């Protein structure tokens, strides 16, 4: 009997993740930022710093960057904070796929809590 992770819930509590900046950037994209809706990871680049951490995913909201609260920041504000965060970037993230799925066209959350796009 194979034990798929797919049948396992993704943790919903906040987590602390440390990223080490490459010679290319932190390796993820963000969406959101309008009217305090929040900043969400929409894409993680294969092989990039966020990927290498192995602790971030599409659908994570970025709550803070190096202790600076980003929950109500604009995307531009978030981009600036992330750019200016130095070589070692400490992120507090929280998996919020339902909120995230609102932003991505034809996306939804399945019974396992995974984000699916049709």
Swiss-Prot record:
Palmitoylated. Palmitoylation is required for targeting to postsynaptic density, plasma membrane and synapses. Palmitoylation by ZDHHC2 occurs when the synaptic activity decreases and induces DLG4 synaptic clustering. Palmitoylation by ZDHHC15 regulates trafficking to the postsynaptic density and function in synaptogenesis. Palmitoylation may play a role in glutamate receptor GRIA1 synapse clustering. Depalmitoylated by ABHD17A and ABHD17B and to a lesser extent by ABHD17C, ABHD12, ABHD13, LYPLA1 and LYPLA2. Expressed in brain (at protein level). Detected in juxtaparanodal zones in the central nervous system and at nerve terminal plexuses of basket cells in the cerebellum. Expressed in cerebrum. Expressed in hippocampal neurons (at protein level). Isoform 1 and isoform 2: highly expressed in cerebellum, cortex, hippocampus, and corpus striatum. Residues 16-96 form the PDZ domain. It is found in: Cell membrane; Postsynaptic density; Synapse; Cytoplasm. Belongs to the MAGUK family. The PDZ domain 3 mediates interaction with ADR1B. Postsynaptic scaffolding protein that plays a critical role in synaptogenesis and synaptic plasticity by providing a platform for the postsynaptic clustering of crucial synaptic proteins. Interacts with the cytoplasmic tail of NMDA receptor subunits and shaker-type potassium channels. Required for synaptic plasticity associated with NMDA receptor signaling. Overexpression or depletion of DLG4 changes the ratio of excitatory to inhibitory synapses in hippocampal neurons. May reduce the amplitude of ASIC3 acid-evoked currents by retaining the channel intracellularly. Interacts through its PDZ domains with ANO2 and NETO1. Interacts with KCNJ4. Interacts through its first two PDZ domains with GRIN2A, GRIN2B, GRIN2C and GRIN2D. Interacts with ERBB4. Interacts with KCNA1, KCNA2, KCNA3 and KCNA4. Interacts with LRRC4 and LRRC4B. Interacts with SYNGAP1. Interacts with ASIC3. Interacts with SEMA4C. Interacts with CXADR. Interacts with KCND2. Interacts (via first PDZ domain) with CRIPT. Interacts through its first PDZ domain with GRIK2 and KCNA4. Interacts through its second PDZ domain with the PDZ domain of NOS1 or the C-terminus of CAPON. This is Disks large homolog 4. It comes from Rattus norvegicus (Rat). The lineage of its organism: Eukaryota, Metazoa, Chordata, Craniata, Vertebrata. The gene is Dlg4.
